[PDB]
Design a protein around this nucleic acid. Sequence first.
RNA 1: AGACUAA
Length: 451
Amino acid sequence: GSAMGEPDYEVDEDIFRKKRLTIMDLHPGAGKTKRILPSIVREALLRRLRTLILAPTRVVAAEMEEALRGLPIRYQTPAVKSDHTGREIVDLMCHATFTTRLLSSTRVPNYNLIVMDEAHFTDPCSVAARGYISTRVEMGEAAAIFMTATPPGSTDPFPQSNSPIEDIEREIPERSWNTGFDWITDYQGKTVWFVPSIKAGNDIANCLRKSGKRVIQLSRKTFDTEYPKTKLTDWDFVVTTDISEMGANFRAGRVIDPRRCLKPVILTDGPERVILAGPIPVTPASAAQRRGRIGRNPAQEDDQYVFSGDPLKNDEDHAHWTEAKMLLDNIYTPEGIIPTLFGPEREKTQAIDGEFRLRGEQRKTFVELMRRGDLPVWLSYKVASAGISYKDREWCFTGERNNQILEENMEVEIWTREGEKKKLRPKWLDARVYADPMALKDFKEFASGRK
RNA sequence: AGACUAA
Ligand SMILES: Nc1ncnc2c1ncn2[C@@H]1O[C@H](COP(=O)(O)OP(=O)(O)O)[C@@H](O)[C@H]1O
Ligand SMILES: [Mn+2]
């Protein structure tokens, strides 16, 4: 038994058995991250188990550190700074960090216990990680615990909460607004507002500030200096991307959720390419996670969730299912086994197995294009499997006529390392490297030979 | 688009 949000003395021996995958399917705010996880970790240390803890984002990682503070844990994330002796048997890192380590030339510890928090995360690295973890369990090499309020197959956008939630459907502005949305600024409590992009977040946040509102902007770019500020009394609005979709304990009163996002889609009609489709409705699991940011305080009973529109459950055309398989086909078990996708996430798209297997230098190039080149999984796969080296940027110019990249209606020119002037016309098109002007600048640096 | 950047 336990009290005071403190960990339970009693932990089930069942969850530590090899060949055992435990799905902890508990509602938002039940105590997965900050009460259950510490109990498991303390009991893992006593059992002397080589242990891996996985967070989807740095927001979840920071939440974990608060609960795990004092324990001999090795943090492998910029989100947390702590002294490490080097003899820690418990490692903590993000989902994508682990997949990266699995794809790189050196070698993950042989964990016999793996705890993945937010085991529904649809980021391609997270899906591939679940594939690895579930084969390790199947082989009898590890015990694993998957913690999530929205396990695969979740259709309920309004799950159980610690406190009653007032669900309100209203129109929500995507852009700045002069007028017509007084309900946003008339509210007295603290609001968490989910935006599909940092661009949209910028022009919504400066719109709120000119109304004398204290606004914190959260994303991958501002996390470091800004997340400690949410752990304060000095804010009205948190305008956040999906970095805060999971795990966050903002201690707020309201979530504004437009329930929209841009989705990468692989197009198969004609030459294969990636587009950014949408904005389209988010999944029921995303809506449920976002709503899960509030109604967490049993002493605070009038929290609000303001949303717009229905969710869209069908995401089979989302590129993350192909890309997860592109990664997992190149990940190997120490025994030699390529892992298969976690049960519930199989046949989201037409497999077939080992289709994305890369050889020798191609697998290294594949990883290098993602980690050093900052290119998406699909694009990196296409370049690597064509036998192109990481530093060979020819493919950025040899695309068919229709692949010519435009910026402000003008044909993009690249000046190369050697002073050639060439039109940006890549052989493979991925809208993620050209849609946003900031993304395109980075891709222009890549095409130059300067990345 | 968003997330991750470890050894
Ligand atoms: N720093 C804190 N101070 C007070 N309460 C907290 C703090 N962090 C989390 N909580 C509360 O503890 C409960 C469980 O938190 P958590 O473990 O994050 O739940 P879950 O991971 O299942 O969403 C929630 O009610 C949450 O609001
Ligand atoms: Mn949690």
